[PDB]
Ligand binder design. Structure first.
Ligand SMILES: *[C@@H]1O[C@H](CO)[C@@H](O[C@@H]2O[C@H](CO)[C@@H](O)[C@H](O)[C@H]2NC(C)=O)[C@H](O)[C@H]1NC(C)=O
Ligand SMILES: *[C@@H]1O[C@H](CO)[C@@H](O[C@@H]2O[C@H](CO)[C@@H](O)[C@H](O)[C@H]2NC(C)=O)[C@H](O)[C@H]1NC(C)=O
Lengths: 222, 213, 49, 222, 213
């Protein structure tokens, strides 16, 4: 029932203060503990402090003298502010609950994290292009088409199809970091070839770090 | 502000059982039994597994079991099902009033098939051409042993400029997928009558070939 | 070094009646498989410290 | 409100004991009488005993010395067991209520029966095939397509379209008993021809006596 | 453990009235008046009509009436509407503590139209061909006088092997539908350049013709 959800940007250069929030969905503030958990790319997890609700605290002395957690019980927020980041803190950031009362401990419902990069080279908007099928691109009764996204500094871009219409045969390939330093990826869908002349599709790229939101239709080739 | 201990990847055949270890000092795991385990699927959010060395919360299979001997806990899975290929972390309540996480362990279910590469090729898009650009795109998926190598080619020639490649990565069907990108000037795309993409995977070499219009 | 002499029960078949007391030490049986007095998966000692 | 519903298999060879139940839907056990009524193919009805609820009985002496009715009031069941069948009892079997209190009598809400064949030649699974339309199969703005089901011993097979999506222009033809002794039938739908290139359809054969449940998509021809 | 008595089919024109009889001994219907009537539509479950020689339960039209004279009851319908073509059964409470049912009576509303046969033809399905089989399928519906005869044909020839036919049966619109099946070896289906289905119905002969691809 209860779910979490992150917020906040990240792309700032090195040596500043970032912020994040974890607005609570199902509604359970004021009773538990709430903590923030880092994870670098490809490495293991970590941990940072928590904040009861009435009182408070902070923790993980290794990160002490840098981190401050705050809570707004009215609108149900955790602020977390780290200061003077160092581009070694380029990680995903989960905000899992905690658990007491019934001992349990460990943690609990998490929150999908937030890629937070730390470097120069401010955001860039992606360029979108379509990948039309063809007589060679069909496999008899089936055929595939796609969309190319190119040259963006966000890194954590997302892609849907027809406002999340289709979940069959949709595949999003991992992004490749080009020598330029910009990422570019592709999305593809394979579907029964017959519907090619009658039906329409739009791939919808959402780039949260910039504000880019581009939805482009795919069409058969001439 | 240090860390725990865990082995790297392990191996195992379906239907069997397997046990993964988690060893720490006798001031965190020895002197406590608040350990808990967490399962994380690639590119997902970790999932809560069992609190107190053993106690599957209502909602988890009963093929999992936790246990302790002394400053060393362990997790056992029974009847390895080929959807448990994930990472497994252990946590506890170290002194100094703080928590700690393991190092992760990639579970390998020792997959059976030798799926062959599904390959596809995509020529430049028109808007990209008019945009003074060209980028040939080679896509591969649904091959099990993730050891493919891709070779970019002019109409048949080995070409080594503007080639970028990702490393294979796991699908949801436990198979693998990869991509290769060939950046070219529009004069290069109008230049060759064809191009080809060669995928070598377990000796088998599959090739795609396209042509401007 | 840890005072491991203070235990508590963490598994029982059914919640206690008020003011009821239970000092037994039988191996708890989570799963359907019988336990036969030995530990193992789904056969847990019922006291923690 | 209250409805009935049969259960139980039937295909057993000759000279055995069959079983059936009539679980009650709306909930009215313990107050009425409940009886079982046979009907051979193409002939008139018949009658067998009933069972009050607290006490009980059995009836129709012609069928006496063969039939036993029982009632489970907890989960609201009637068992009926006839013994040493003779392949002359190859009929549909309804489980109608009865009525007392307010005299009425006769009977009341029935239960759709259950074809119960008695012979050798154990069940066979059907083979499904599609019947695609064509330029000859369209009638200008309209066109028809279908599904063939073949070679099954169940006899009482059933057919739906897209999980019961469509009720327009759907027709199921009666089954033909082939010289082999196996039945085979066809289902058809006619619809405005325009939707042929855009839309999809699946015919869903359910065979309760075996466990066959096959759902096959229909497609335009190449 | 015997039976009652009822006439077979009756006839009638719309808007008129009709009366169907149900005669039994004077130990079941004479000596009782617990008779009830039931209407059953083809391939359906019978429907309760009136208990006690007459008493339409709240939900039934008022065009029905029941009556008795002596060990003989009867049911009268008024303004015959052409959706009452069904079977009608009577039941009672014979002695010996048992019930009994009639013999059924098919009501015929004396339909007006002479609907012509809608015919269609279907060639083998590909999977069936590869399955070493062939079965031409001839379907007919929406013809009123159910007296059609179907003739299977090679490209035009009368063919009499592998032909199976159902007898017509009533639709919901009171019309009729039937089918014919022609089983053939795949070599037979690739063998003829065409095939034809001929439906004769009231002199009128309608024909369909198909061809492999
Ligand atoms: C928390 O306790 C740990 C010990 O369990 C402290 O860690 C260090 O101990 C290791 C030996 O086990 C030494 O090699 C390190 O040099 C020690 N480092 C420090 C900073 O003491 C750890 O420091 C304690 N942290 C807090 C906040 O109490
Ligand atoms: C129930 O009563 C009927 C009579 O109404 C019994 O039937 C038979 O009566 C006919 C003459 O009407 C004879 O020709 C048959 O030979 C009789 N058969 C039998 C078995 O008696 C019927 O038998 C009675 N059944 C019961 C259980 O009492």
């Amino acid at each position: 029932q209860v779910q979490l959800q992150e917020s906040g940007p990240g792309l700032v250069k090195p040596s500043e203060t970032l912020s994040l929030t974890c607005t609570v969905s199902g509604g359970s503030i004021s009773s538990y503990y709430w903590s923030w958990i880092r994870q670098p790319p490809g490495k293991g997890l970590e941990w940072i402090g928590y904040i009861y609700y009435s009182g408070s605290t902070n923790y993980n002395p290794s990160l002490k003298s840098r981190v401050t957690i705050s809570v707004d019980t009215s609108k149900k927020q955790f602020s977390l502010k780290l200061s003077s980041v160092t581009a070694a803190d380029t990680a995903v950031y989960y905000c899992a609950r905690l658990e007491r009362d019934w001992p349990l401990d460990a943690f609990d419902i998490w929150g999908q994290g937030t890629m937070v990069t730390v470097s120069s080279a401010s955001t860039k908007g992606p360029s979108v292009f379509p990948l039309a099928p063809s007589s060679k691109s069909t496999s008899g009764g089936t055929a595939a088409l796609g969309c190319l996204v190119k040259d963006y500094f966000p890194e954590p871009v997302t892609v849907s199809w027809n406002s999340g219409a289709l979940t069959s045969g949709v595949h999003t390939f991992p992004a490749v970091l080009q020598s330029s330093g910009l990422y570019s990826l592709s999305s593809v869908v394979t579907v029964p070839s017959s519907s090619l002349g009658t039906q329409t599709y739009i791939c919808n790229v959402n780039h949260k770090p910039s504000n880019t939101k581009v939805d482009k239709k795919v069409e058969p080739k001439s | 502000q240090s860390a725990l201990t865990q082995p790297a990847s392990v191996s195992g055949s379906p239907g069997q059982s397997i046990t993964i270890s988690c060893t720490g000092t006798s001031s965190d795991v020895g002197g406590y039994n608040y350990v808990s385990w967490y399962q994380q699927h690639p590119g997902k959010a970790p999932k809560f597994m069992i609190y107190d060395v053993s106690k599957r919360p209502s909602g988890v299979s009963n093929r999992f079991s936790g246990s302790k001997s002394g400053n060393t806990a362990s997790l056992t899975i029974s009847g390895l099902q080929a959807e448990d290929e994930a990472d497994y972390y252990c946590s506890s309540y170290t002194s100094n009033n703080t928590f700690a996480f393991g190092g992760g362990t990639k579970l390998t279910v020792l997959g059976q098939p030798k799926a062959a590469p599904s390959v596809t090729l995509f020529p430049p898009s028109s808007e990209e051409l008019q945009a003074n650009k060209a980028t040939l795109v080679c896509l591969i998926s649904d091959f099990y042993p993730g050891a493919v190598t891709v070779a970019w080619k002019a109409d048949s020639s080995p070409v080594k400029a503007g080639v970028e490649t990702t490393t294979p990565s796991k699908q949801s069907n436990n198979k693998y997928a990869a991509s290769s990108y060939l950046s070219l000037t529009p004069e290069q795309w109008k230049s060759h009558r064809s191009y080809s993409c060669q995928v070598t995977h377990e000796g088998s070499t599959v090739e795609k070939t396209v042509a401007p219009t | 070094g840890g005072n491991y002499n203070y235990l508590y029960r963490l598994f029982r078949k059914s919640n206690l009646k008020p003011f009821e007391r239970d000092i037994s030490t039988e191996i708890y049986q989570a799963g359907s498989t019988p336990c036969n007095g030995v530990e193992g998966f789904n056969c847990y000692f019922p006291l923690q410290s």
